Design an enzyme around this catalytic site. Sequence first.
Site, PDB file in Angstrom:
ATOM      1  CG  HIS A  42      -0.648  -0.590   2.440  1.00  0.00           C
ATOM      2  ND1 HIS A  42      -0.329   0.186   3.539  1.00  0.00           N
ATOM      3  CD2 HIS A  42      -0.518  -1.888   2.837  1.00  0.00           C
ATOM      4  CE1 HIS A  42      -0.035  -0.631   4.555  1.00  0.00           C
ATOM      5  NE2 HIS A  42      -0.127  -1.890   4.141  1.00  0.00           N
ATOM      6  N   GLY A 144       3.679   6.930   9.492  1.00  0.00           N
ATOM      7  CA  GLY A 144       4.966   6.699   8.850  1.00  0.00           C
ATOM      8  C   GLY A 144       5.748   5.513   9.438  1.00  0.00           C
ATOM      9  CB  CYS A 146       3.564   1.558   7.335  1.00  0.00           C
ATOM     10  SG  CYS A 146       1.874   1.625   7.987  1.00  0.00           S
TER      11      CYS A 146
END
Lengths: 303, 303
Positions: A42, A144, A146
């Site tokens: 993603h 952020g 991820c």
Amino acid sequence: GSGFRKMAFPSGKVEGCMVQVTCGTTTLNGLWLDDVVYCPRHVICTSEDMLNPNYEDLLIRKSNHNFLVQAGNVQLRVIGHSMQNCVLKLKVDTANPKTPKYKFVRIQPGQTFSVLACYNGSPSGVYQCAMRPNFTIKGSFLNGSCGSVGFNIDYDCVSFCYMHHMELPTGVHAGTDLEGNFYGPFVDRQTAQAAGTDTTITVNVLAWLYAAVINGDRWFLNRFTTTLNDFNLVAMKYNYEPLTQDHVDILGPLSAQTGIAVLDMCASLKELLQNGMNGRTILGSALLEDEFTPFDVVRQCSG
Amino acid sequence: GSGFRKMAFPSGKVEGCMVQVTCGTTTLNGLWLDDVVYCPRHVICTSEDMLNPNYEDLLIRKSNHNFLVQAGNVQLRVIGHSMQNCVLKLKVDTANPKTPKYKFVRIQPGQTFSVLACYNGSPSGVYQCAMRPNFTIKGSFLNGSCGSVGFNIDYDCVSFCYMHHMELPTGVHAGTDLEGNFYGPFVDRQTAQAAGTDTTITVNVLAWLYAAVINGDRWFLNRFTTTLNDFNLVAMKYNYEPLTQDHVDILGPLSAQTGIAVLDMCASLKELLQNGMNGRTILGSALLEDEFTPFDVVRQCSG
Ligand SMILES: *[C@](=O)([C]([C][C]1[C][C][N]C1=O)[N]C(=S)[C]1[C]2[C]([C]N1C(=O)[C]([N]C(=O)C(F)(F)F)C([C])([C])[C])C2([C])[C])C1=NC2=C([C]=[C][C]=C2F)S1
Ligand SMILES: *[C@](=O)([C]([C][C]1[C][C][N]C1=O)[N]C(=S)[C]1[C]2[C]([C]N1C(=O)[C]([N]C(=O)C(F)(F)F)C([C])([C])[C])C2([C])[C])C1=NC2=C([C]=[C][C]=C2F)S1
Ligand SMILES: [Zn+2]
Ligand SMILES: [Zn+2]
């Protein structure tokens, strides 16, 4: 005795693998091992897409050159790309010179691991976590985060077990193994999603009680014993996972170090569940801890 | 929100500085920076000496070549030695190629730092700690942990603030700065030694309550306010350190982020001290936490 802390593995070997991955305006963390970079798929989503993305259609509009991989202040060249479940794998022209020995593992509920929380490909902090029975974690993670990873260290070998993807409405966290398969029933879209009922990891609670004894904290040792079935009826009521003879066997080291039979320690746990802690503490805690495994307790208390 | 954990700094930069130091049969950890190795001076003690050592007389019987410094599986050559307070400094022929930018700092009571717990010059785990008001720490440390260091990371610079030396009879820990000066009244001999009465670090407790609000945990916010003197009379009674206007000012960021005045948050804290927590939890704790500073909370909650 030793004292007692939530201890993480030393993070140096993983610090050397973290990179920044950008696609259009989205940026997140990736893991650079040999000549592959792993990140959440993603990364290719905008704010619009995340409600219900068609990842295949989105990825089709992307080339190698749409992917900006940066290590420190140094770009890498992307020469191939493929989606594996919920992970993107980017082939780059350069093998990571800092790559450690490593495996990818899928961990079980109740096991622990260290998280190296990263932002913009830069390491910010390290902490210890458990995979809950309902396949969430209770992490600390900002926008952020991820692509931050969780892992264990065997000796010279890093076993990667987790990649961070999302925060669920309850404020707990979900993510994948390094092959892109979610832990739990979650999907990578912005939708209301529920984890089940969580349960206490009974065997971990028992390990922590053994750690307490080893450190000299012995007030709660009561005068009774119990049976597995007797204990497990009580456990049911308080939302503890059922104890099995596997669990008994895994606790054998701590049992033998302390001279206290598992079933006796179970008897002490029952009484704590039914009577509560009455203002006392154990290893400085006013609650029963379930995020140290038997292995964890052995490492920190015995070495 | 973010969630909330005791987070340590990434340990990689320090992992590259740890070495094994041996003198006769005693072995412990040292820190290799440029061409100096720092370790506790009682590396030169046997079991006999430790009751009441004359360190000068002991050190006189030692030469450069009595000191065996090993980095991984590789020896270093010792070309000079000097005692600085409770630390031994060994000059070696090789500058550490992995040396980071670094300072030595003496920290204040109430400040936090990360510990890289080491054995035989090898890193075992990382955890976060506070310097208690009575200049002890609550660590996790086994035989052979001595010479393990504590530190903070500014950006690219490691500030070393602690070297581990001993466990006191209460099972808490004492040690030095990197110049060899003890925190607290302790000396490096095996003798009964007492720390004073410890106190709660009030400003840290207030920071943690702000973190709770930021994460959505707001049950304890009560309807009153208070004065500094009013609060400080109550604090005295419960063994909290007195709050000053310096502390008020340091909490300004969290105060302004949340829109809740320090004195209002003090009012909520008083009520918790007098009424207790009544079975509730805060950020999953049944006790009031005092080992996160205002800076710590800002890093993890705001980033
Ligand atoms: C990540 O860094 C974040 C991490 C997240 C931010 C807040 N706490 C965290 O752990 N992950 C996000 S933005 C994911 C991604 C979309 C929505 N989401 C969520 O975590 C989301 N949760 C859900 O919708 C859920 F199903 F209920 F769990 C919110 C409401 C908490 C925001 C994904 C695809 C599930 C990433 N940031 C970005 C990513 C991709 C593109 C742009 C980003 F900014 S992944
Ligand atoms: C260290 O590694 C240990 C670390 C210690 C072991 C148990 N928990 C720990 O943090 N430090 C020791 S052995 C120090 C050294 C002598 C006695 N001592 C103690 O920590 C001691 N405490 C006291 O006597 C006190 F004053 F009450 F605090 C005990 C009773 C807890 C053992 C020193 C010089 C103070 C080191 N190991 C060795 C060292 C030197 C030589 C040989 C070692 F094995 S330093
Ligand atoms: Zn546990
Ligand atoms: Zn605190």
